Structure 1
Amino acid sequence: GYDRALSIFSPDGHIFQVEYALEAVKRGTCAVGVKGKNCVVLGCERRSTLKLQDTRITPSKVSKIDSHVVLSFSGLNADSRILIEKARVEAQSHRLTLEDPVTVEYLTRYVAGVQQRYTQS
């Protein structure tokens, strides 16, 4: 039952574990998206640390959440997987209970909420 407060305030009013999490983001491979008049594109950047990399079996940077919404990230990889699973499940549960797929905003608001909770637990 480890419940040590890791995310706390410091005297300037900053939460340093949340801020050091941002640093982890800056490090990650760049990601971009832009809105067309009738589309959205997601652009990402491939890591050039090493090659001999198998391209067809390495996890892509863009993930489908439902069949009409994608998520791309930047930062810790292993971390992003957890977030993606949670949203994919909420996408299904939302459809199971309301008989509609998630709006993009709803799903964003969901993922956002998950992260927020980890800053306060």
Structure 2
Amino acid sequence: FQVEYALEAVKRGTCAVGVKGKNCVVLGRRSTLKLQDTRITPSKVSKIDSHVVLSFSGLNADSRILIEKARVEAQSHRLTLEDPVTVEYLTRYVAGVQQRYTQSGGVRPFGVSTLIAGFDPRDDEPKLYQTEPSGIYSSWSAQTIGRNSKTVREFLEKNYDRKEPPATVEECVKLTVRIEITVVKPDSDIVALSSEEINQYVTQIEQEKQEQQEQDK
């Protein structure tokens, strides 16, 4: 088999989480060695363009090709139609590239899954899509790909509700991971959080858990 082994290779990758809110999208690193330089590190969340961001899971080298192709396609669409690419168009292009690579023998088409998030230009509706080998792409409001997947998806299902999406962005960012966070906002806004902000969120989560234990235990 070829698709199943690619999915197995995907399962060995680092966990990635994507969540969409009322007016924002939040996209969610291993233990660096003692002699590893982290000053120059390729962030796991790569922005395809000012309004669409991508987060991979699986083989990094194979994901670089997909990211480069997506960026080139976005620039080509911008040059050909004068309009920046939409989220669904870019997701469909990536899925088509993966599906084309699955055929023609396909010892290993790409062995990587992706999450594409953002906003359509001149619009403020969050868009989140999940792309997997065999060219299958789907839409989600809270998705996870990686080692755990099932546990994180169950946590999101029991916590995230499809009746009142979080209005503010802080609650969307304040997500327990049991870490990199990228926030996408309309009018082509992309913000990558720093280590201090994520540490502050973690300390807030720990203090909230301690308070809950103190109240009830």
Q: TM-score of the superposition, structure 1-length normalised?
A: 0.80
Larger strand proportion of the pair = 2
Measure, in 1, the Cα distance between the counterparts of 2:32 and 2:58: 15
1:54-98 C-alpha deviation (Å, 9 max, x unpaired): 222111101011111100000001000000000100000000001
Identity %: 98
Measure, in 2, the Cα distance between the counterparts of 1:49 and 1:36: 32
Which runs of 5 or more residues in structure 2 are unaligned?
Answer: 102-215
Measure, in 2, the Cα distance between the counterparts of 1:55 and 1:31: 20
Aligned-residue RMSD, C-alpha? 7.9
Displacement of 1:111 in angstroms is: 0.5
Please give the secondary structure, in 2, of the residue aligned with 1:73: strand
Decide which structure has the larger Cα Rg and report it.
2
Asked which structure has the greater RCO (Cα within 8 Å, sep 6+), the reply is 2
1:14-49 C-alpha deviation (Å, 9 max, x unpaired): xx1111000111100000010010000001xx1126
Distance 1:23 1:49, change over 3 A: farther
Distance 1:26 1:49, change over 3 A: farther
Q: TM-score of the superposition, structure 2-length normalised?
A: 0.45
Please give the secondary structure, in 2, of the residue aligned with 1:21: helix
Distance 1:113 1:52, change over 3 A: same
